[PDB]
Amino acid sequence: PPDLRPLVPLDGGRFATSDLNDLYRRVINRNNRLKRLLDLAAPDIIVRNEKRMLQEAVDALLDNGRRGRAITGSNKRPLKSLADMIKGKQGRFRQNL
Amino acid sequence: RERMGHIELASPTAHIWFLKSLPSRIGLLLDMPLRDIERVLYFESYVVIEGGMTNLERQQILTEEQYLDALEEFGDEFDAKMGAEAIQALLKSMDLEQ
Amino acid sequence: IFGDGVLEILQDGFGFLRSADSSYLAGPDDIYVSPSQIRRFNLRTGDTISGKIRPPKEGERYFALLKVNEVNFDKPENARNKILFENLTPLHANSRLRMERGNGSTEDLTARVLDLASPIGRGQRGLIVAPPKAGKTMLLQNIAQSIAYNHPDCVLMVLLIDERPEEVTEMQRLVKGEVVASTFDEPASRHVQVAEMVIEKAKRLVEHKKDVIILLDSITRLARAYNTVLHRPKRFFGAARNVEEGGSLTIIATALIDTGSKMDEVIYEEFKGTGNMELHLSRKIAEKRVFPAIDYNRSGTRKEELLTTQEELQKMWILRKIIHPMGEIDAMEFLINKLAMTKTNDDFFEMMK
Amino acid sequence: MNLTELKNTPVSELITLGENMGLENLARMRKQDIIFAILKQHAKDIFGDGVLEILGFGFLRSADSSYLAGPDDIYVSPSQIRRFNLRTGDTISGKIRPPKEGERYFALLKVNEVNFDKPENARNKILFENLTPLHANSRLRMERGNGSTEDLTARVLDLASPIGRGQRGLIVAPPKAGKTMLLQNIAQSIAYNHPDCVLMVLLIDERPEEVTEMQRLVKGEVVASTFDEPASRHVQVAEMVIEKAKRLVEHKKDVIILLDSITRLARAYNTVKVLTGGVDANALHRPKRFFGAARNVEEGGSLTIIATALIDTGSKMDEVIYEEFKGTGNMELHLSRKIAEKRVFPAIDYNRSGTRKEELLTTQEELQKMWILRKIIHPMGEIDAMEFLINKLAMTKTNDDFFEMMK
Amino acid sequence: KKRWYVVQAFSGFEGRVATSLREHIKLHNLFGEVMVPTEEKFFPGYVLVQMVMNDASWHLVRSVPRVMGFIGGTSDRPAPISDKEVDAIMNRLQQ
RNA sequence: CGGAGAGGUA
DNA sequence: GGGTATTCGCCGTGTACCTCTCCTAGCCC
DNA sequence: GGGCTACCTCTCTGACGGCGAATACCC
Predict the structure, then answer these.
(1) Per-position DSSP letters for C124-168, written without gaps between them
(2) Omega into B23 within 30° of 0, i.e. cis?
(3) Beta strands per DSSP E along chain A
(4) Among C223, C330, C341, D276, whose Cα sits 20 to 30 Å from the Cα of C123?
């Protein structure tokens, strides 16, 4: 739900968007690309990899950094997936429960 | 705050948790080692699905060349796929009681 | 399931097929047009699309177009190789569109005076200047009836924007043609949309070698619509042109003057220098119940030698040299008494010499 | 492989040529997309040309499209502009290449010809702002001499206001007077008498039927803009014309500009503190420089701009524009509406017509004969003088025989 | 005879990767043509290249900056596209 | 109504 | 047939409090 | 400078406590 992942209404036009909203944005980007790529009947060599790009996009959405190179933010900082908000010392259990 | 939404994916995908659970739930369920499961899901190899009357194995793993080579002598009942749909179809073809 | 309608491409990329009986109004049962089919056939706004449709599925609210069967009353193979309206070379009025009935009826007197004062041809761009309560309704019906009688092949479209509903039903049940209108019961947003659907449909027919004649009695009303929501109405007026490759577009509009508002005067003064035909009507002759109350001295047509012969132009010149010294009322009484002696204008020309 | 060559080819040959190359079916395609597709397949060298329009970058506009922004414009990098000191109006002709992946316009690799001349002659040149202006010295006679019936308009124009190189005149005429036929007779006489001069006809905010009529009637370049286009394009077209004209004069060329929308052009700048009539204080500054740009160069070349002013149009704005530009030029050719209503062509006001410093274009005996002719025409009325002039010029073919019989 | 392959970086860099690729070809003096599909956009970063698969060319296609390389079954050998699919994308490239 | 890093206190 | 011997990353990081900083601009247009 | 939408470079932050475990080494 959007209230559980809001933005940062700071003073200005820029927004330090949440890592989850950025991840959901990338998945929709990589999905609408694949949805259009199939109606055009593109070659398999493109559909095959683009599904892998979609595959590696959902994995970061669920649990980023576990498979391999963690999808970073701007330059260095990694992004918090859905697992990071429940796993660890900063999860809901050991920080809010 | 208390209602969600869904997203219709253009292609099925696997869950990273069950894929790398240590031990992998997907791995030991199909007797398939995790070493090649990563290549199948990430579109890097092939797996047999309902081979039929041929010299193949139920869950044998074969590369691109072996895919093309086997297609030359067997291209009627031969059926190999790659990605999450291949394993998803393999999951539905599996049986519990047997 | 078969359907039909005029295409209206939205800004987002897709479009719908409006209905003709609803005066091109957005309906709940409009046929959705996918952008893929628009790119396939290079469809634009105004293209008459008729083909197989299907009911909407779960999550849809419009009929999807599966396959188009006929485009602009023609095969798609003939509409794919066409010339755009923006590339057509305009020309002056060449073909003569005679308004005279020829039956010798008293209703033909309006058309006879119109031919002697302002001959109308294909591609003409004129204005019917007339104050309120001058006889614009009777003059318009005489023109529409004369066109359907003399030139039945021409496509007559009477677009009435911001008019009375009872007058719309009267005109639709009197003239022989298509009648699209948009009463004042709805805001100017629909007035602009209906006006665009007509000019787009007219341009497509001209591209298909058709002679479209539009009698728009709302150029003053349409100008107020754009001013509420002169660049747009001027392009709509200037769209009328005679195409050398084939077809023509004639737009006869009626301007309103002396309406008590100075805004209409500026609109009339600006559009005066655009067209090449002005048919002024006198209020004094109209209040005296003398129809048609046409100001012969104020009327005229530029480049009239391209629509009339040498002997016909000379007779009109001699007629004007005699009418001009006489007064407005005296000229009409002289003209009516001379045209009443015979039935056709040929006998009138023979007696003047 | 030239861009202008493929633009002149018909659509039928372009579709046939494209099908032989193995491409998309060119039936449902635009002509510009057809040429763009052929250039790509043929490049897998290409040459182009056009007038430069510097924005730091720029493009090469085409003359057949009235300098309109098209997809086939050649991109000009600012590095090449800074290297060769290129400005707006310089004709650039060199090798071009199709746009690569991620690009949308043709790029310029090497320039071959600058302003229809070698680049070594364009790198060293005197600017137009430094040329010394002068009066009209060379005589640009408008008389045909073939004894045609249409030559009477040119004969009266020569006796009323002789036109020379670098002349900046004004054609004052109310609407519905015969400005169209008068402009055609002038343009046809210039192309017939002086075919070496560069004739440019500018028609801003005019009817499309009139645009295609002038384009297929005069023997020269026709750059026009219909009323369907906003005032922004009217400003851009006017600037591209005056910039190209200045660059040609800098190369010692005789440029002739027949303007017919000086009033419409002023409305364009006024659209893009309000005085009497609705004219802005800084709106007439741009048409003022565009008009006064015409001048005679002593080093070589000239610039002639003949504009037609509109009066009695019912708008007070046009009257202020006309009254301000009246004291700007040095030649006024007034036309009378009363004579035009009598179907007496041409309807020229010979009384108010005239040219300052006319002795620099006519001989001593010719100036005296014109002076005596005016002293006989002045007492007579406007309509009576035209009927007298037409009946006397119709008896002979040349104006010399007319002056010989008056004495 | 030259075959077709896909030069693939992180999706999006189709534009500049080819301008440098063509220029890198003329410096090394095995490469036929690189095509750009687009509409009035599919393959958001996947470029088809007409070339032959050689050990020297394997490093050359990886030596161009701002690119990942070929994608296939393993990093050992790249995977071709198809024989009929090349004609399929060629048709849609024109039409 | 944030995320990392640095320093300090018990 | 399996019972140990490498190996390469894999999850185990005391509590609370205070101060301060850093935060994306890339490409042809 | 930027508008929809591209554009960086790095995998096998490195230790230890060890732990079941994929691979591998004999018993």
Answers:
(1) -EEEEEE-SSSSHHHHHHHHHHHHHHH-TTSEEEEEEES--HHHH
(2) yes
(3) none
(4) C223
Tokens of E89: 């994308």
- The burial of D228, by beta-carbon neighbours within 10 Å (0-12 exposed, 13-18 middle, 19 or more buried), is given as middle
Count of CB atoms within 10 A of residue A45's CB?
Answer: 23
Tell me, yes or no, whether D233 and D374 share the same domain. yes
Checking DSSP bridges between strand C155-161 and strand C178-182, what pairing results, if any? parallel
CATH architecture of E1-95: 2-Layer Sandwich (3.30)
| D56 interface with C at CB cutoff 8 Å | no
Contact D51, D81 (CB under 8 A): no
Resolution as reported, in Å: 7.7
Q: How far apart are CA C117 and CA E50, in angstroms?
A: 74
Q: How far apart are CA D76 and CA D70, in angstroms?
A: 14
| Of residues D156, D140, D149, the one with CA closest to residue D333 | D156
Which 3 state secondary structure label does DSSP give D70?
Answer: coil
How many other CB atoms sit within 10 Å of the CB of residue C312?
A: 18
Residue among D202, D167, D207 at smallest CA distance from D183:
D202
Technique of determination: cryo-EM
* Phi, then psi, of D15 in degrees rounded to 5: -70, -40
Cβ distance of A55 and B84 shorter than 8 Å: yes
Q: How far is CA D66 from CA D7, D106, D219, D240, D255, in A?
A: 14, 19, 17, 10, 18
SS3 category, D333: coil
Closest CA to D369 of D330, D319, D403: D403
Three-state secondary structure readout of chain E? CCEEEEEECCCCCHHHHHHHHHHHHHHHCCEEEEECCCCCCCCCCEEEEEECCCHHHHHHHHHCCCCCECCCCCCCCCCCCCCHHHHHHHHHHHC
Both tokens of residue E36?
């750009």
Given an 8 Å threshold on Cβ–Cβ distance, is A1 in contact with B13?
no
Count of structural domains within chain D:
2
Question: Which of E:70-89 have CB within 8 Å of B?
Answer: 72-74, 79
Query: Is the Cβ of A66 closer than 8 Å to some Cβ of chain B?
Result: yes
Which of C78, C98, C113 represents a domain boundary (last residue)? C78
Both tokens of residue C128? 């019917």
For strands C178-182 and C242-243, give the pairing.
unpaired
Evaluate whether B34 touches A57 at the Cβ level (below 8 Å). Answer: no
DSSP tag of A76: S
Residue D162: which residues within 8 A CB-CB, separation 6 or more?
D139, D141, D355, D358, D361, D362
**Is residue D375 domain-shared with residue D251, that is, in the same domain?**
yes
**Helix C165-172 and helix C136-150, axial crossing angle in degrees, nearest 10:** 20
The tokens describing D352, both together, are 């108010």
C68-81: b (≥16 Cβ within 10 Å) or e: beebbeeebeebee
Q: Which of C116, C119, C101, C99 is nearest to C307 (CA)?
A: C119
Tokens of D47: 């040459």
Give Rg (Cα) of chain A. 16
B20 touches chain A (CB under 8 A): yes
Residue D207 amino acid letter: R
Interchain CB distance below 8 Å, A66 and B11 = no
Q: Which residues contact C260 (CB under 8 A, 6 or more apart)?
A: none
Identity of the residue in A37, A41, A43 whose CB atom sits nearest the CB atom of E82 = A43
Domain that holds residue D198: 124-407
Q: State whether C323 and C345 are in the same domain.
A: yes
Main-chain dihedrals φ then ψ at residue A35, nearest 5 degrees: -65, -40
Distance (Å, rounded) from C-alpha C259 to C-alpha C131? 7
Domain boundary among C78, C93, C120: C78
